[PDB]
Paper text:
Programmed death 1 (PD-1) and its ligands PD-L1 and PD-L2 are key co-inhibitory molecules in the modulation of T-cell mediated immune responses. PD-L1 is often overexpressed in different tumors, and its interaction with PD-1 on T cells enables cancer cells to evade T-cell-mediated immune responses. Thus, blocking the PD-1/PD-L1 interaction can restore T-cell activation and antitumor responses. In the present study, we report the crystal structures of the N-terminal IgSF V-set domain of PD-L1 in complex with the Fab fragments of atezolizumab and durvalumab, thereby elucidating the structural basis for the blockade of the PD-1/PD-L1 interaction by these therapeutic antibodies.
We also determined and refined the crystal structure of the IgSF V-set domain of human PD-L1 in complex with the durvalumab Fab fragment at a resolution of 2.65 Å with R/Rfree = 0.181/0.219. The asymmetric unit contained only one PD-L1/durvalumab complex with 1:1 stoichiometry, and all residues in the complex were well defined by the electron density. The interaction between durvalumab and PD-L1 buries a total solvent accessible area of 1,624 Å2, which is smaller than the PD-1/PD-L1 interface by 346 Å2. The binding interface is almost equally contributed by both the heavy and light chains. The durvalumab epitope is constituted by the C strand, F strand, G strand, CC′ loop, and N-terminal region of PD-L1. In total, 16 residues of PD-L1 participate in the interaction with durvalumab through hydrogen bonds, salt bridges, and hydrophobic interactions. Most of the key interactions of PD-L1 with durvalumab are concentrated on the central CC′FG β-sheet within PD-L1. The side chain of PD-L1R113 makes a bidentate salt bridge with the side chain of heavyE57. The side chain of PD-L1R125 makes two hydrogen bonds with the backbone carbonyl groups of heavyF103 and lightY92. In contrast, durvalumab and avelumab bind rather perpendicularly to PD-L1; therefore, the bivalent IgG of these antibodies would be T-shaped rather than Y-shaped when binding to two PD-L1 molecules at the same time.
Author numbering:
A (entry chain B): 1 to 134, 143 to 222
B (entry chain A): 18 to 133
C (entry chain C): 2 to 214
Write the structure that this text describes.
């Protein structure tokens, strides 16, 4: 039961600093090489940093060499990435990975679930929620929030089938926008209640919009 | 640009014989020992820790006392050669070569041992 | 060391065999080539290490082969759970590097999108912007075209689109397109139209509305 859990991510503005942490369980942490791997939204995987069992050697990709510092505490069962001088291209989900075997010859054995790091000038901001009014289709326009993520459900989870919550797009403004739709029988318009539940944890706002025909 | 290389990434040797595995690293003209670090490791044991022109035997695993030698004259040629004498079946496995000379890098080598 | 995965996308039915390629710009020391599986929203899972060995619990329809600079991952007799993005990675030589990924998508029968158009809410217009939305629902294949027309004039640079991941049940895709305008620009025009072409349509589908009607 090898487990890996990242913490410490969020929003930070360019040139700023942030410290990621990774907690391990189910294996002897002092016996293994450990890596950081990141993934930018929609892109592929990129290795970042490496550390030896005893912290005695550290390696980095070119892009972060001189800016990121990897370190570890075997007693605390924990891995760290101190990120400094952060640019916008550092925006990504950051994963911790165990390198299996003695020297990593079993590749990346196990991964954490990742934590999102967002690097941008924009301030945290709660979404505006607009009704997309009406087989019929209806939904919610969740607009101008920052940063990711946002949570969308319908009728408090009691409505699931035919629901499409689209991935958010980064708008020209630098704020995020998305829509959630659902297809329903035309006959259900008027008799059935449809409430869009929007939950944006960063800005700590919750919204319930009832969508009706006009 | 600084890169540790391995002529062979796999060695197959007979039980009881001698073996010399090699890590190569770039050296231009004369080699300055003060700037140079060499580690050879096998599993969680340390075979060779070469710092300041000297192998450090207090860090060396005792399995390897008397049978393990970094070949010093080979170093000028950018070749970290590890000679292990009287090779036993326990010597089979993955080895690690770390070399620091300005920049720093490492590689792994697999050793396989046939029994008779 | 650059790894070039191939091809970009595979469209296959369950039970078919999938072949994935990984080429390297250098020899990969000791054949330390891993493969990984990633599903949307999840971290990668290790599949194969040392090019040909299965990671623990990985089922045996996952098989690796190759050596040197050319590596293959084969999934014979695909199960629905096997459709994901696959990555190869070299750990033989620093810096560790990943290829750009291959997506294996479920190939189903062609399906036409249902098309809906949504006018801006009155609540939104007080913000000064108007968002016009166009939903394309449950189609296959993924390739779908959306043109925007305001009073039969084509639009450029004021649209954004978004696509869902392939559906769990349907194996279909859906798409939203958002046309954004000034409130001032919006109230200057009458007809807002959304025009759609797709393999599953034999004639173009256009949904429209008139402002105020």
């Amino acid at each position: 039961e090898v487990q890996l859990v990242e913490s410490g991510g969020g929003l930070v503005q360019p040139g700023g600093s942030l410290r990621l942490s990774c907690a391990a369980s189910g294996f002897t942490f002092s016996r293994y090489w450990m890596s950081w791997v990141r993934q930018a939204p929609g892109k592929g995987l990129e290795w970042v940093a490496n550390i030896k069992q005893d912290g005695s050697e550290k390696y980095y990709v070119d892009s972060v060499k001189g800016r990121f510092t990897i370190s570890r505490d075997n007693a605390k069962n924990s891995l760290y990435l101190q990120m400094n001088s952060l640019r916008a291209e550092d925006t990504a989900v950051y994963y911790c990975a165990r390198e299996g075997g003695w020297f990593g010859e079993l590749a990346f054995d196990y991964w954490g679930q990742g934590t999102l790091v967002t690097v941008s000038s924009a301030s945290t901001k709660g979404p505006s929620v607009f009704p997309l009014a009406p087989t019929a289709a209806l939904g919610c326009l969740v607009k101008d929030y920052f940063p990711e993520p946002v949570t969308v459900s319908w009728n408090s989870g009691a409505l699931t089938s035919g629901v499409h919550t689209f991935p958010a797009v980064l708008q020209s403004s630098g704020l995020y926008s998305l829509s959630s739709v659902v297809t329903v029988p035309s006959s259900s318009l008027g008799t059935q209640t449809y409430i869009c539940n929007v939950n944006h944890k960063p800005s700590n706002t919750k919204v319930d919009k009832k969508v009706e025909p006009k | 640009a600084f890169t540790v290389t391995v002529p062979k990434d796999l060695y197959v040797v007979e039980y009881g014989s001698n073996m010399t595995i090699e890590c190569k690293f770039p050296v231009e003209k004369e080699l300055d020992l003060a700037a140079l670090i060499v580690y050879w490791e096998m599993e969680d044991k340390n075979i060779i820790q070469f710092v300041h022109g000297e192998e450090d035997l207090k860090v060396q695993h005792s399995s390897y006392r008397q049978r393990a030698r970094l070949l010093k004259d080979q170093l000028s040629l950018g070749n970290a050669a590890l000679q292990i004498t009287d090779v036993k079946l326990q010597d089979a496995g993955v080895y690690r070569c770390m070399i620091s000379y300005g920049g720093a890098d490492y590689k792994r080598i697999t050793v396989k041992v046939n029994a008779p | 060391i650059v790894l070039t995965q191939s091809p970009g996308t595979l469209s296959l039915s369950p039970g078919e065999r999938a072949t994935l390629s990984c080429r390297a710009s250098q020899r990969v020391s000791s054949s330390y080539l891993a493969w990984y599986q990633q599903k949307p929203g999840q971290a990668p899972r290790l599949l194969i290490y040392d090019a040909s060995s299965r990671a623990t619990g990985i089922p045996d329809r996952f098989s690796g082969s190759g050596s040197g600079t050319d590596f293959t991952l084969t999934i014979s007799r695909l199960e629905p759970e096997d459709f994901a993005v696959y990555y190869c990675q070299q750990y033989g030589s620093l810096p560790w590097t990943f290829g750009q990924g291959t997506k294996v998508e479920i190939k189903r029968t062609v399906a036409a999108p249902s098309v809906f158009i949504f006018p801006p809410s009155d609540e939104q217009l007080k913000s000064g912007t108007a968002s016009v939305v166009c939903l394309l629902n449950n189609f296959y294949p993924r390739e779908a075209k959306v043109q925007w027309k305001v009073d039969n004039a084509l639009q450029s640079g004021n649209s954004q689109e978004s696509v869902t991941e392939q559906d769990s049940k349907d194996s279909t895709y859906s798409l939203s397109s958002t046309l954004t305008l000034s409130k001032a620009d919006y109230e200057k025009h009458k007809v807002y139209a959304c025009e759609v072409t797709h393999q599953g349509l034999s004639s173009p589908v256009t949904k429209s509305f008139n402002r105020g009607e």
